[PDB]
Design a protein around this ligand. Structure first.
Ligand SMILES: CC(=O)N[C@@H]1[C@@H](O)[C@H](O)[C@@H](CO)O[C@H]1O
Ligand SMILES: *[C@@H]1O[C@H](CO)[C@@H](O)[C@H](O)[C@H]1NC(C)=O
Ligand SMILES: [Cl-]
Ligand SMILES: [Cl-]
Ligand SMILES: [Cl-]
Ligand SMILES: [Cl-]
Ligand SMILES: [Cl-]
Ligand SMILES: [Cl-]
Lengths: 102, 459, 102, 458
C-alpha cells in the first residue's frame, strides 16, 4: 500500500497519490492495487486529471510501449520499425542484426 | 326423469329447476319442461324457428339462453307467458334487425343480450314497455347510428354497450332520456364527430368509453357529465386538450387518452380534479409548461415525455404529495428543483434531458425512492452528498453523462448501477462501497476487473 | 377443443372463432383455453376486433358483472346500488329485502 | 554482492541490475559495480547528486531517478555514461528543463520529464540528443510549444505534451519532427491552431487533441498524409466541413464525441477506405444521411439525435461490412431494405417515426442478432418480414401501434418486448416461442396464457 491515498485489507491500494500510476497486480485467487512511478514491462502509463493507470500494450509482437499503438521494444526475433514489430524488416530499409531494428 | 331427455338439470337455491339443454343440436325445443323451471339454457343448438314452443307454461322462468343458434327472426308472440323473465340471451345469432315486436312489454326484463348478431336497424318502438330493463348489449353488430328514438323509452337503463359497430356521429341529445345510465361503452366504432350537447341527459353516468374511434376533436360534450368518474378516449385523433376541459367533471378518477397525437394541453386543463390518480402524456411536443395541478393533489403517477419542458417550478412538489412515479424523460430539463417535498416518490425517470448538475438537495430525504434514472443527460458534477438520504435506492442509471468522478455516500444498497458513456470517469470503484451490486455497467472494463469481475459487469 | 380455430395439444384452445370469448380454465397444473358464448360466473366478456376474452370481476362484494366496474349481482348479504355493492344502503334511499337491492 | 540494502540481479552473464529504490536515501550509494547495466534510484530523498560514483558506469543503460527531490541537475551529472539509453526523471521538482545537463547524451533514446513543474524549455537544452526517440513532457506547467528546443530532435518518434497549459500552436511549431509517429496533446487548453501548425510532420500516424478548447475544425491536419488515428473529442467544434479528411486517406480511427457537432459536409467522410467506425450522437441539425463513397469498411455506424427523415434506397451498397447500425432518435418514417448490409448483427432504430415494416426490409440478414424498433409508430408488420433471420435472438417492439404480431421465423428468440402495444390483445403461445427467457407482453393475461403468471411481465 505504498504511494496510496486510499488503502484496504485484501484489495491493496484503491486510489493513488496524484502523480503515480495505478496497476492491478494479479497473484491469482486475489488481486492488489499498486501505485507506481512507471508501469511494469508490458504496460504503458496513461495520465489523466483524475487518475493515471497502467494499460496493457496493445501491439503485436511487442514487449514494451510508449503508448497503445507505439512499441518501444519488440518480442524476440521481430524487428522494430516506427513503433511496429515485423518478422522481415520490409523493403525500403534493411534490418540491423546487431541492433534488432530497421 | 324430472329432466328432458339428454338435458341436464339441477335445483337452484329455491329448489326451482335449472335446465341445461345446450349443445344438443336440437332444431326444436324439448317437450316436458317443469312449470317450476327457473333457468333454461338452449345455447349452441340449431334452432331457427320458435313456432312449436312449450314456453307459455313456464311462469317461473327467469333466465332464457338462446345464444349461438340460427335465429334470423323472432315472432310477436314468442315470449308470451314468461311473466317472470329477467334475463334473455340472444347473442351470436343472425338477426339483422332487433325484432320489431317480440321484445315489447316483457315487463320484468332486466338484462337483454343482442350482441354478436348482424343487426343494422333498431325499429323505433322495439323496446316499448321494457319498464324494468337495466342492462343492454348491442356490441358487435352493424349499427351505423344511435337509435335515438328506440332509446327514448329506456329511463331505467344502467349499463349499455354499443361497442364494435360502425357509428360515425353522435347527435345532440342522442341518449337524452337515459337518466339512470351509469356505464356507456362506445369503443371500436368510427365516431368522428360529437354534437356539443350529445351527452346531455346522462345525469347518472360514471363511466364513458370512447376508445378506438376517429375523433379529431376533444369531446366538449362531457362538460355536462357531472358524475363522471372514468373517461376513456384513447386511440383517437385528438390533437389538443383545451383549457377548462374537465371543469364539469370534478369526480374523475381516471382519464385515459394515450395514442392520440396530442400536441398542446391547456394551462388549466388538469386543475380541480381531486380524485385523479394517474396522468400520462407521451409525445406531447408543443407542451412547453409543466401543467398546473391546483386542486389535483392525489396523483400517484405522472408521466410527461417528449415535450419541450425546460423548467419545473421550485415549488412543484407542493402539488404532488402522493406521487409515487414521476417520468419526465425526453424533455429539455436543465435545472432541477428539490424533490424532497415529493415524499412518496418511488421511481424518478429523467433520462434524455439536458441536466448538467445534481445539487445537494435535489433528492434529499426521499426515503421510498427505489430507482432513479438520469441516463443521457449532460451531468458533469454530482454533489458528494446528493444521494446521502436514499436508504431505499436500489437502481441508479447515470449512463451517457459527462462525469469525471462518482459519489459513494448513500449508495451502499445498490443492486443496479449504470455508468457507461462517461468517458472521463476513469477513477476506480471498490467492491464494498457497493457490496450489494448485481448488475454494473462501467465506463471501462478495467473498472469491472478492479471491482472484482473480469455478478454481471460490462464491459 | 370446442369453438376453436387453433387446438393445441398439451394445452386448450389458442385462438377462438370470431364471436366467442376466450377463457383460461385452470385444471390445477396445466391450464386450458376454452371458447364460450358468454363468460362464466364471476367474469365479464370483453370484445375486441380479434380477441374476445373473459376477464374476472374485481368489484368488491360482487358475484357477477357487466363490466369491470358495473356489478350485476352482489354476494350474499350485500345490497346492489348503481352497480356497486354495499352493506348499508346509503341515505336518500333505504334497503329493500325481497331482491337485496336499493 | 551489491551496495548495502540495495537489491541486485544478473542481467545476462556479466552485467548487473541494481535496485536502490525506496530506501529513503539522501545521497547515492558508494560502491557501485562497473558491471551495472541498470540502476533504479526511484522513490528516495535525493535533492542533488554532485557526490556521485556514476562516471565509472560505462555500461549503464537505464538510470531511474523518479520520485526524488530534484529541483536542479548540474552540467556534468551524467558525464561518462556512454551507454545510457533511458533516463527517468519523472515526478520530481524541476521547474524548467535543465539548461545543460541533458545536452550531448549521445546514446539517449528515452527521456521522461513528466509530472514535474516545468514551465520553461531552454532553447538548447536538447542539443546533441540525436538518438532521442521518445520524449515525455506530460503533466507539467507548459504554456506554449517550445519550438526552438524541438528543432534539435529530428530523430524523435514519440512525444507527449499532455496535461499542460498550452493555448495556441503556431505555424511550423513541430516543423523539423519529420520522424514523429505519435504526438499527444490531450488535456491542454488549445483554442487556436495555425493553418500550417502541423506542417513538417511527414511521418505522423497518431495525433491526439482530445480534451482541449478548439472552436473550429483543425483544418491543419490536411498535410498529415500518413495519419491513421485522430482524436479531437471533448472540444467545442460544431462543424466538420466538406473535404475535411481529404488529406488523410489512411485514417483507421477518428474520435470526436463530446463535441457540440451539428453540421457535417456531404463529402466529409468519403474516401476513407480504412475507417472502421463512425459515431455521431446528438447531431441535431443534420438532415441528411452522409455519403460514404469510397469508405466501404465501416463496421459500426452510429448516427443519433438528428433530423434524418429518410435513407437513400441504395444506402446499404456503401455498407457492405457494417456489423452495427444505430440510428436511434431520428425522424425516420420509411425504411429501405437492409439486405445488402449482409454483415449486420445489430440494428437499433428506436425512437423514430416508422409506421410499417415491409416484407423486404430485413430479408436475408443471416447474422442479425438483435433488432430494436421500440418507440416507433408501427401499425403493420408484414407476416414474412422476419422469415429469414435465423440468428435473431432479441426483438424489441415496445410502444408501437400493433394489433397483431408475426410468428414466422421467430422461434429462436430469447428476448421479446411488446409492452405499449395496447391493441395487441391476441394471444401468443409458448409453442412458437420455446426459446424465450425474457418477455414483455402488452397485458398480464398474455403472460398467463404463455404459461407464466423464465420471465414474463406484467
Ligand atoms: C523523508 C525525508 O524527507 N527526509 C529528509 C528530510 O528530513 C531532510 O530535511 C532532507 C535532508 O537530507 O532530505 C529529506
Ligand atoms: C322519459 O322516459 C320516461 C319513461 O319512459 C317517460 O315517462 C317520459 O315521457 C320521457 N321523458 C322525456 C323527456 O323524454
Ligand atoms: Cl487495459
Ligand atoms: Cl319483425
Ligand atoms: Cl424499476
Ligand atoms: Cl383478468
Ligand atoms: Cl540549470
Ligand atoms: Cl431509451
Amino acid at each position: 500500500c505504498k504511494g496510496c491515498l486510499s488503502c484496504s485489507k485484501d484489495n491493496g491500494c484503491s486510489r493513488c497519490q496524484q502523480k503515480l500510476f495505478f496497476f492491478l497486480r494479479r497473484e491469482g485467487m486475489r488481486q492488489y492495487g499498486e501505485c507506481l512511478h512507471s508501469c511494469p514491462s508490458g504496460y504503458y502509463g496513461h495520465r489523466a486529471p483524475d487518475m493515471n493507470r497502467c494499460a496493457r500494450c496493445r501491439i503485436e509482437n511487442c514487449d514494451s510501449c510508449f503508448s497503445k499503438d507505439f512499441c518501444t521494444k519488440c518480442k524476440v526475433g521481430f524487428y522494430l520499425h516506427r513503433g511496429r514489430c515485423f518478422d522481415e524488416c520490409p523493403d525500403g530499409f534493411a534490418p540491423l542484426d546487431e541492433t534488432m531494428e530497421c | 326423469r324430472g329432466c328432458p331427455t339428454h338435458c341436464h338439470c339441477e335445483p337452484d337455491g329455491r329448489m326451482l329447476l335449472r335446465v341445461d339443454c345446450s349443445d344438443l343440436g336440437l332444431s326444436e325445443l324439448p317437450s316436458n319442461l317443469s312449470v317450476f323451471t327457473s333457468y333454461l339454457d338452449l345455447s349452441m343448438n340449431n334452432i331457427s324457428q320458435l313456432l312449436p314452443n312449450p314456453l307459455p307454461s313456464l311462469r317461473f322462468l327467469e333466465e332464457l339462453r338462446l345464444a349461438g343458434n340460427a335465429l334470423t327472426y323472432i315472432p310477436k308472440g314468442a315470449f308470451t307467458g314468461l311473466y317472470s323473465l329477467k334475463v334473455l340471451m340472444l347473442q351470436n345469432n343472425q338477426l339483422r334487425h332487433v325484432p320489431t315486436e317480440a321484445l315489447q312489454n316483457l315487463r320484468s326484463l332486466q338484462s337483454l343480450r343482442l350482441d354478436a348478431n348482424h343487426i343494422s336497424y333498431v325499429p323505433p318502438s322495439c323496446f316499448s314497455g321494457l319498464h324494468s330493463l337495466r342492462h343492454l348489449w348491442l356490441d358487435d353488430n352493424a349499427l351505423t347510428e344511435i337509435p335515438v328514438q328506440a332509446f327514448r323509452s329506456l329511463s331505467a337503463l344502467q349499463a349499455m354497450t354499443l361497442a364494435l359497430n360502425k357509428i360515425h356521429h353522435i347527435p345532440d341529445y342522442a341518449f337524452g332520456n337515459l337518466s339512470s345510465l351509469v356505464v356507456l361503452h362506445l369503443h371500436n366504432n368510427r365516431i368522428h364527430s360529437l354534437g356539443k350537447k350529445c351527452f346531455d341527459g346522462l345525469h347518472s353516468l360514471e363511466t364513458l368509453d370512447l376508445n378506438y374511434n376517429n375523433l379529431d376533436e376533444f369531446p366538449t360534450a362531457i362538460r355536462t357529465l357531472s358524475n363522471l368518474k372514468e373517461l376513456g378516449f384513447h386511440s383517437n385523433n385528438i390533437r389538443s386538450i383545451p383549457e377548462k376541459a374537465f371543469v364539469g367533471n370534478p369526480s374523475l378518477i381516471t382519464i385515459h387518452f394515450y395514442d392520440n397525437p396530442i400536441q398542446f394541453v391547456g394551462r388549466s386543463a388538469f386543475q380541480h380534479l381531486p380524485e385523479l390518480r394517474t396522468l400520462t402524456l407521451n409525445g406531447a411536443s408543443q407542451i412547453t409548461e409543466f401543467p398546473d395541478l391546483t386542486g389535483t393533489a392525489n396523483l400517484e403517477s405522472l408521466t410527461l415525455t417528449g415535450a419541450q419542458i425546460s423548467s419545473l417550478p421550485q415549488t412543484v412538489c407542493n402539488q404532488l404529495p402522493n406521487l409515487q412515479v414521476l417520468d419526465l424523460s425526453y424533455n429539455l430539463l436543465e435545472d432541477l428543483p428539490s424533490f424532497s417535498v415529493c415524499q412518496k416518490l418511488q421511481k424518478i425517470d429523467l433520462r434524455h434531458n439536458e441536466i448538467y448538475e445534481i445539487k445537494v438537495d435535489t433528492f434529499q430525504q426521499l426515503l421510498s425512492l427505489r430507482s432513479l434514472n438520469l441516463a443521457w443527460n449532460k451531468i458533469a458534477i454530482i454533489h458528494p452528498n446528493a444521494f446521502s438520504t436514499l436508504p431505499s435506492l436500489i437502481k441508479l442509471d447515470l449512463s451517457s453523462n459527462l462525469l469525471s468522478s462518482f459519489p459513494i455516500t448513500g449508495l451502499h444498497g445498490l443492486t443496479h448501477l449504470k455508468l457507461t458513456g462517461n468517458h472521463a470517469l476513469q477513477s476506480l470503484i471498490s467492491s464494498e462501497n457497493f457490496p450489494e451490486l448485481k448488475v454494473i455497467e462501467m465506463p471501462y472494463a478495467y473498472q469491472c476487473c478492479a471491482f472484482g469481475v473480469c455478478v454481471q459487469c460490462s464491459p
